[PDB]
Amino acid sequence: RKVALVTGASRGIGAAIAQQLIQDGYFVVGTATSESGAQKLTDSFGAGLALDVRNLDEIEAVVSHIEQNYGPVLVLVNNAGITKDNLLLRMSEDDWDDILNIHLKAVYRLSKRVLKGMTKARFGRIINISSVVAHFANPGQANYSAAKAGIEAFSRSLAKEMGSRQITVNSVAPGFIATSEDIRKKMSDQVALNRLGEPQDIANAVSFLASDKAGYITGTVLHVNGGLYMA
Amino acid sequence: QERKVALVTGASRGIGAAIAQQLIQDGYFVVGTATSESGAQKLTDSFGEQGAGLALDVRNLDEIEAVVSHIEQNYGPVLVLVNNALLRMSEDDWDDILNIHLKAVYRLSKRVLKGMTKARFGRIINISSVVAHNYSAAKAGIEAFSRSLAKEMGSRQITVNSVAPGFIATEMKKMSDQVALNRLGEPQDIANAVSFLASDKAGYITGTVLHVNGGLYM
Amino acid sequence: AQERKVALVTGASRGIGAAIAQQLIQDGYFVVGTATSESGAQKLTDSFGEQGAGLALDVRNLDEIEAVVSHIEQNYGPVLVLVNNAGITKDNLLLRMSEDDWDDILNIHLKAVYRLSKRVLKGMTKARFGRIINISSVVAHFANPGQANYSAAKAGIEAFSRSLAKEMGSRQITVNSVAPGFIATEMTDALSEDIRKKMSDQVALNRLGEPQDIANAVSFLASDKAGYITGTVLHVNGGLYM
Amino acid sequence: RKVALVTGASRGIGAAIAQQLIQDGYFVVGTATSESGAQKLTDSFGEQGAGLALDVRNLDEIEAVVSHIEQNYGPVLVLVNNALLRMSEDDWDDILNIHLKAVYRLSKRVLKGMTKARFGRIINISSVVAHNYSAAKAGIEAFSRSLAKEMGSRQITVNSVAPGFIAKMSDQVALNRLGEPQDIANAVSFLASDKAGYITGTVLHVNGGLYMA
Ligand SMILES: CCOC(=O)c1c(CN(C)C)n(-c2ccccc2)c2cc(Br)c(O)cc12
Structure with missing residues (x-):
């Protein structure tokens, strides 16, 4: 069993991806921010680990551990959902650094x-x-x-x-994915398919990309947004 | 005939052939079209029970309507449609290129x-x-x-x-140096992409270009 | 008294930044440019004459950024044309890209822009x-x-x-x-030739660009003739990328 | 003077574009669908432009016009081509023919x-x-x-x-106002000049922030 590591697996898009990769035949290590979260993941499958994506030493801890125990990571899914929205005038340095760290730096590390x-x-x-x-x-x-x-x-x-x-x-790149009714309808009007997405839709695409069926696809953005954005 | 019907234009060889074969494993009844009657006869032989070959010149509108009607009557509604494949040139050559590549798709x-x-x-x-x-x-x-x-x-x-395919093996090779994965594709690679798009796992993907070129272009 | 609008151009010592700063002057902005050193700043002053001013600035440092903008408002006027320009690189294959190679480049380019x-x-x-x-x-x-x-x-x-x-x-x-493409710069001047040609093969116009090409684009957007263009990317790459 | 050909120059955007190219210093040939329209264009250009009748439907008119321009004024060095559902094939053929076929020719x-x-x-x-x-x-x-x-x-x-909203629509726009024909002519003048020599294959959006790409 090739091992696959899915960060942010506790809920929504991440949970769906980790589950789907199980069905695909992968042994899946899912992570969450806190140890409450990692044990549930342990249960939902039968391996979860607690990871703060902001810390280099934790990242080194988890990966080094997995290679010893289960096998080298061969599918890596970098998933993060946290937002800290604010108008620029009201957006702090900490608000900027946190999101850049959790989303982009974590992918690098x-x-x-x-x-x-x-x-x-x-x-x-x-x-x-x-x-x-x-x-x-x-x-x-x-x-x-x-x-x-x-x-x-x-x-x-x-x-x-x-x-x-x-x-x-x-x-x-997910679009409007489910997880105010008027806000919802305004989002829907923009989507060509006329509805919002579900995490399963993203899981399905990640599964495809993760498989041998997508061995010749690389360096691409696969958009999963029902025609919200075309390109 | 029970299954959903998929129609694949130019299913004779290479990518077309591979797409139609896959859609069959996926469980569709597949109608693959060739330009000539001899070509369509070959398809019928190879698809066997789970397909049919029909002759179609995608350029003629009446022929387009005749073929879909024949399918509608014999097999069922067409639920999947796969349209298989220098401007300083003659105007006719250009119009022919867009009749076949664009007008047909529209039709x-x-x-x-x-x-x-x-x-x-x-x-x-x-x-x-x-x-x-x-x-x-x-x-x-x-x-x-x-x-x-x-x-x-x-x-x-x-x-x-x-x-969008990149370099796929037709016959043939340092074109592959231009490809990040460092090799030419196979028709099956395009077939796999089409199958994912064609299935119920891709219901929220639209307006998109799925690139299958090994990182030739990004 | 100085009565021109003020433009701040970061990284104006050479190449693209230099050309931008020279051109905005001709457009009738009072141009403040930055350099990574005091000696670099001096040269800008000796070049911007009475139409501009040089200042030293390390874009990675917040205090230093607050000090420079404050000083601009204090000595020249509010900043109404901001051009964030940076050429510094730290190339490496991810195998050998350190934490600092990453952090430093993201701080100079993306972070500076935010600040x-x-x-x-x-x-x-x-x-x-x-x-x-x-x-x-x-x-x-x-x-x-x-x-x-x-x-x-x-x-x-x-x-x-x-x-x-x-x-x-x-x-x-x-x-x-x-967004400039393959612009002939001091850094591009250093490379081999079959490779500069390798770059040019890819360009539709079949040549490398000039810093003046980017300066021309920025002058246009900076001017009153682009008052209805916003939130876009203006590509100046000779057809390399369409 | 280098010659610029601007099709559909009669009103709005096309008119503003022709006028700006004249100010910039090109000799401008504007086209109109009929001969009076062309004469009007000629009157408004002073002695620095000319008007020709061209119905872009017909490829044959294109040969005569460009030839006419080549023989009387000079070679065309700037060419501005000015401006959709389930409808009949014919409506599609006509739109494509105007918007794309004419351009090619x-x-x-x-x-x-x-x-x-x-x-x-x-x-x-x-x-x-x-x-x-x-x-x-x-x-x-x-x-x-x-x-x-x-x-x-x-x-x-x-x-x-690619213009956005050119003279609520305004509420959708970031700058919160409609554009003016002059907004498009400015963008065109920039591209047509020696300032834009290294810009090709691009789309210059002038929509005030309506769409961002
Ligand atoms: C069948 C509808 O498409 C066209 O007829 C043409 C298109 C495709 N566009 C509309 C997305 N194109 C087209 C082809 C290549 C690139 C962009 C547009 C046309 C170009 C000319 Br010229 C023409 O006379 C017809 C078409």
Whole structure:
């Protein structure tokens, strides 16, 4: 069983991805911010670990541990949902740094860390979860938008570098995903499919990318937003 | 015949052939079309029980309508439609290129629209051409057109997507140096993309271009 | 007395930053440019004459940024054209990209943009006039290896610009990005030739660009002739990326 | 003076574009669908422009007009091409023919003169937003890129300009107001000049923040 590591697995999009990767035949390590969260994950499967994506030493702890115990990480899903929206005039340095750290830096550190296993193995999937706001301006989301756009760019670069070693690096960019009724309808009017998304939709795409069926897809953003944004 | 019907234009060889074979494993009844009767006869032989080969020249509108009607009568509504593949040139050559690559897609999409609207399910997938050994006009045209169709067909729960191959093995090779994964694709790689798009796992993906080129272009 | 509007151009010593600063002068802005050293700043003064002023600034340091903007308002006027420009790189394959290679590049490019942007808004919201032009790069969209940190920073700049353009619209402040491609620079001058040609093969126009090309683009957006363009990316790459 | 051809110059955006190109210093030939319309254009241009009748439907008119321009005024070095559902094939054929077929023919026709002078600008303006992924607009934008790659070798630039709301609609716009024809003419004048020599294959959006790409 190739092992797959899914950060932010406790709920929503992350939970759906970890479950789906189980069904796909992967042994799945899901992580959560606190130890309450990691044990549930242990239960939902039958391995969860607590990880703060902001800390380098924790990241080194978890990955080093997994390679000893289960096997080298061969599918890495970087998923994070935390937001700290504010208009720029009201957005603090801490508000900026936190979101940049949790979304973008974490992708750099974990992607850097797993390369070794993937390179030896002749096989690798790094799948980064971005968002449609990387491309759609929404106010109060300066920090979140920038982080997600940075992840997509990062993925393209990393895809060039590691392609020789048969490792694919892609981003999946969810649209309006479910998780005020008027706010909901205004979001819906924009989507061509005329509805909001569900985490299963993202899990389905990540599963595809994670499989042998997507061995020739790399350096791409796969959009899953029902026509909200086309490109 | 019980299964949902998928129609794959130009299913004779390579990518077309591979797409149609996959859609069959996926559980669709597949009608693969070739330009000539001899070509369609071959398809019928190879699909066997779970398909049929029909002759179609995608250029003629009456032939387009005749073929879908024949399918509608014999097999069932067309729920999946896969349209398989220098401007300083003659005007005729250009018009021919856009009749085949763009007008046809428009015609077949309009033609099958009703059946998909009724079932409230539909897949339209357009395969752009293989890269020669980026900003090609046919590809660009086709991808811009998929986005627009997708905007219109969306309310009815129909997805329109294109799939862009890079270098795929035809026959043949340092073109592969240009590819990040460092090799040429296989037709099956495009087949796998189409199958994911064609299935119930891709219900919220539309207006998109799914690139299958190993990082040739990003 | 000085009666021109003030433009601040960060990283104006050489290449693209230099050309931008020289051109905005010709456009009739009073241009303050920055350099990484006091000696670098001096040269800018000896170049901007009585039409501009040089200042030393390490864009990674917040206090230093607050001090410089404060000093501009104190000696020259509010900053109504902000051009965030930075050329510094720290290339490496992710295998050998350290934490500091990452942090430092993200701080110089993306962070600086956030900090300087934020510090000049109110001074722009007051005069109801405003231009923030953020220099991006084509490697934000054009996969390039060994530049993961620089590509992420630049792509982030573009998205940040879109988001701010939305919040600052009511106030008549435009926020755009300009994204140069393969521009002949001091750094591009150092490379081999079959490789510079390798770069040019990819460009549709079949040549490398000039800093003046980027200066021309920024002057246009900075001027009264682009008052209805905001939240966009202006690509100046000769067809490298379409 | 270098010659600029501006189709559909009779009113609004096309009119503003022709006037700005004159100020910039080009000799401007504006086209109108009928002969009186062309005469009107001629009157308004003073002695620095001319008006010709051209119904862009007919390719045959394009040969006569460009030839007419070549013989009387000079070679065309700047060419501005000015401006959708389930409807009959015919409506589609007509829109495409105006928005895309005419452009192709015009672009092909001025290509040798631009090629010989080592200078060229083709600038395609898409239609205003009504009242995004509209087919004519998407098509024209896609077409401009393809033309850009092919024509780049000859130092000819091909770009697109995409207006938003040009004179609530205003509430959707970031700058909170409608644009003016002059907004488009300014963008066009920039691209048409020696300032924009390294810009090709792009779409210059001038929508006040309506859409951000
Ligand atoms: C069948 C509808 O599409 C077209 O007829 C053409 C398109 C595709 N666009 C609309 C997305 N294109 C097109 C082709 C390549 C790139 C962009 C647009 C056309 C170009 C010319 Br010229 C023409 O006469 C017709 C079409």
